[PDB]
Amino acid sequence: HKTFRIKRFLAKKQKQNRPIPQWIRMKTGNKIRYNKRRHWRRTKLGL
Amino acid sequence: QTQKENLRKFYKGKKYKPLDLRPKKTRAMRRENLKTKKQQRKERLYPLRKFAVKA
Amino acid sequence: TKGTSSFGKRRNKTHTLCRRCGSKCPAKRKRKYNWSAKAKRRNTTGTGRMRHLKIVYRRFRHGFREGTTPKPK
Amino acid sequence: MKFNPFVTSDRSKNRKRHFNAPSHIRRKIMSSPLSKELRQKYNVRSMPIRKDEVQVVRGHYKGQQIGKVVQVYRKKYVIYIERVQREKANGTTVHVGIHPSKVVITRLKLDKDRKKILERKAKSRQVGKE
Amino acid sequence: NKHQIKQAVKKLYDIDVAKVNTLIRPDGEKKAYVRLAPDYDALDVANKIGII
RNA sequence: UCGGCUCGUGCGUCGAUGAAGAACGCAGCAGCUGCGAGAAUUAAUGUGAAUUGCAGGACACAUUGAUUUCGCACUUGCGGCCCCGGGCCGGGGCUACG
RNA sequence: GUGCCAGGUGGGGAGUUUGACUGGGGCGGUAC
RNA sequence: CGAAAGACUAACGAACCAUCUAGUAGCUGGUUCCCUCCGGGGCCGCUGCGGUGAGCCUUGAAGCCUAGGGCGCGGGCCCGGGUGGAGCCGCCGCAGGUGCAGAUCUUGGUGGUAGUAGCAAAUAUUCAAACGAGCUUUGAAGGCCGAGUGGAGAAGGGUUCCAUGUAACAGCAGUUGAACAUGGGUCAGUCGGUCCUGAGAGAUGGGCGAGCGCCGUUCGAAGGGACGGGCGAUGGCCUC
RNA sequence: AGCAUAUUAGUCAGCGGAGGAGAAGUGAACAGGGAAGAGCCCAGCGCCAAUCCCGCCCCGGCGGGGCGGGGACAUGUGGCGUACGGAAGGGGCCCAAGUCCUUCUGACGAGGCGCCCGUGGCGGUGGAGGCGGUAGGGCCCCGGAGUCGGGUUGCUUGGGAAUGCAGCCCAAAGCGGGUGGUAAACUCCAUCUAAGGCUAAUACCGGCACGAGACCGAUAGUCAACAAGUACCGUAAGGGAAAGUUGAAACUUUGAAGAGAGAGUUCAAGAGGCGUGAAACCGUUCGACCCGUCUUGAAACACGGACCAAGGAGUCUAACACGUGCGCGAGUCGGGGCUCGCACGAAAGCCCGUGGCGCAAUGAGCGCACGUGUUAGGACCCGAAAGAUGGUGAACUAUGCCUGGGC
């Protein structure tokens, strides 16, 4: 039992839980080395 | 752009036109030289004069 | 049993997401106070997109001109 | 000495403006001097470098050989030259970036825009001389 | 909605639709299963579209 | 040291034509940032041959020419009025208080 | 009945105080 | 709020959050260089500014290290050597957020303890083979759960579900995993929501209120809807 | 040095409303000197609806002209007139001169010509006046009422028999009324004209865009130099980090692998996804009690201290006193103004002596600087139990109610 808004929030939170693309490490001024990753057990969503 | 230029040519000269065809400067700007006959007569009878001193 | 045992009975949410401020602010006016300047600066004009005020600044720098275009080639 | 206000002369501001310049400003920043022959011909000292025949006058690759510019990477403020290159670990060849201020333009890739820019600069120079 | 999806499929691919089922995927996209009319072969239609 | 702090100067421009703020979405290949279903931007003007992490723009040589959601209610719940099209469905415009 | 002033009542409530010395302090005492 | 214990009010003899607030303290703790005199002097040291040193420096600045040579009562300093890679110092003045061993000091790092305490609740494992560089899988035994250690849901979680593949984590290990990586998966007129009002919440009128507002929920010109008839509905041109 | 009036303080918190300015028109005023400078309009009383708003035609602040219908308005629009009396600047593109000789280096240095430009002596580029830039140029009439005033109450002020504000009661006059800093009666004098309205030197910790600094330099400076109000915590109100630096320029073999041995790049990896790189800690090759502290008394069976690095505590402003140094000296001392423009210059220079302090007391030297001391301020640094204002919670629990389930 979910609402549409909760489900959309969950979908957005799911689409953000991926590693960075590797080619971004090759850019000219890149300071990132890895991804704000979230684990369902380690950290809980704001609900 | 073509549709809106045609619409602006259409509504030109009309007193009332759609809001999007009305100028949008700022709510405050969208919200002067009239003088009363008294002030006009005062200005006519007593205008500011051009003068110099010590001559 | 007021500690660990009581923490296991946590099933019903007091709060949910707000439709105005998005936090988990029905009064027409916004909730803000002078005794929390940190809270005031966490949400103020400039912490968002300003998707209308920046254009206002750009248009002010030119006198709010409209109905004109740069001279065609 | 600089007297004009609204001009910075502050080190941090100058460096920030330099390192965050938009590409059309980096075009004029990445300018090179014209050779003595070209300078005499066009009455122009320097031009923004185009994707030109130039020489290298500083660094490891300085010399008299003339090479064609093959890439202008304004993001890295360097130009790639025809034969100014190096060998990688796996034997492949990679260009070595040279700053345009260390290159002398010997031949100009001329079009209508380049010719009008040269005419503008020469006319300003001759107005200044008069 | 199902009416709009059915009409859009009919107009785009010049075909008939028997029925439409819809779900909203856990990534937020809406997926539609369009069952075609019995007199239409979904394999040939898919080949026309480009898939399969 | 592309950041602060402090001082000074000029200006001193939000919003129902719908703001500040929030949500969601948008790139050929997460964040920040930029944008709004015309979504990593369209047009125009100036500038002038790049963008770049990776192949992928015929760039007319007159190098026109690279660089949305936040009437009644808040569950996408339920309407009403007038038109338009397809035969109930879809589209458009309306419908807050003072 | 309401508005304003006046007198009473009012630990229901508010604020505050409840000295010093001293063969520990309190009690006694005053050598304050 | 309390069948009363000052009990409970998100791990209470007046909750929690921010501000007033760096609240006050006759009280505890700490308070940083040398020498001299009684009981001031520092060719001591740090950072920056004005002058000066035709000062020093990629033929190597600062910084750091050094059982090297020395100077000074010392605060300290000079030189040798190393490594380091870009700036720095002397003198005359000016200025200060200017010298630490303590503050149950603040932050960061690291020891002995110490390969130590420990990895002991719920009866229990064994044989063979397979893959593999090297507790998993299969088969066979022996066992256990027996108002379940079974099969399904609600709240909550939010992808943990499925398949494939494979350092950190799973306090031993792992060829295994709710871990990591890649890619998939949730289909409704009939199962729910959606509809009703329940305790209750809460607009309008009205009242109160300096005001944001809140009191009140029946205490006001509160009906916008009915088959039936004529003007005009004529519109299909009057069936409905 | 308690505390209640007082102070804190009309201050924090709370509520409402703006503008580019607003408002005004313990402890103050007036006079004096400056910055600026600007004045006006209704009602009323009078004379003459003479006034205003809302289809057709003609010319990006919706106006002007003509023509015709509707309304407002006599319960009063307009003209004259109101105290001094009245009427009869942005945007774009450009413009000087060495990459000369020798030489150092991995690559603006050094030595020469000092050569060249200079109205031009910050940044980038592997220590620069000789690429962008910079400098200076180009395209007869005449008065506002539940108002004044009075009483009382509460707050407020320096306002004292009551400065201002407000509630309640009383409640006006017209040679009247207010004020004249002690209540009152009588009486002269002065001064203004309340109860209507408009109106351009000053303020600015927010915003847009700039310039600058005897400031900080990654435990500092904003919490935030970096995907920072982010990660993360809490139901929520809220709380809230850490975190900058390679360089100049990015094949063979052992092993399951991580990981190594060679080889290679580079000035350098004794720079290897990281400048330098300390200490703590680890691997390898005869006299003599422990400091800090409070204490009459400490080695104490008194407290703090496992070790190391970095940070860390007498400051600034104002006042006063005395001492010292300097200038002038019965005097001494310039907020404002003037000096062409703001690199330095928010400097410096010059001048209006108002004013301050001093030169006279009694009664009801100045200015500048430095030091030391005592203060008020956070007040040398850290430290309460408390108090106040506004908000967030009944997901635990407490009790009442509604609708279910179970024994």
Residue numbers in the entry:
A (entry chain l): 4 to 38, 40 to 51
B (entry chain h): 63 to 93, 100 to 123
C (entry chain j): 2 to 25, 37, 40 to 87
D (entry chain Y): 1 to 51, 53 to 131
E (entry chain X): 105 to 156
Excerpt from the paper describing this PDB structure:
The extracted particles were further refined using heterogeneous and homogeneous 3D refinement to yield a reconstruction of the entire ribosome/Sec61/TRAP complex with an overall resolution of 2.7 Å. Resolution at the membrane regions of Sec61 and TRAP varied between 4.0 and 6.5 Å, whereas resolution for the ER lumenal TRAP domains was limited to between 5.5 and 7.0 Å, presumably due to high mobility of this flexibly tethered unit. The tetrameric TRAP complex binds to Sec61 at TM6 on the opposite side of the lateral gate, where nascent polypeptides insert into the lipid bilayer. TRAPγ forms a four‐helix TM bundle with the C‐terminal end positioned in proximity with the N‐terminal end of Sec61γ, and the TRAPγ subunit resides predominantly in the membrane with its helical section extending to the cytosolic side where it contacts the ribosome. The transmembrane anchors of TRAPβ and TRAPδ form a bundle with the TRAPγ TM1 (Ser35‐Arg49) and TM3 (Glu116‐Ile156). TRAPα, TRAPβ, and TRAPδ subunits each contain a small folded beta sheet‐rich lumenal domain that is connected to the transmembrane segments via flexible linker sequences. These three domains form a tight complex of ∼50 × 60 × 45 Å in the ER lumen, which may contribute to the structural integrity of the TRAP complex. The TRAPα lumenal domain is positioned immediately below the central channel of Sec61α where nascent polypeptides emerge after Sec61 plug displacement. The TRAPα lumenal domain is connected to a long 43‐residue transmembrane helix, which interacts with the Sec61 lumenal hinge loop and traverses the membrane diagonally forming a connection with backside of Sec61γ on the cytosolic domain of Sec61. Sec61/TRAP binding to the ribosome is mediated by three interaction sites.
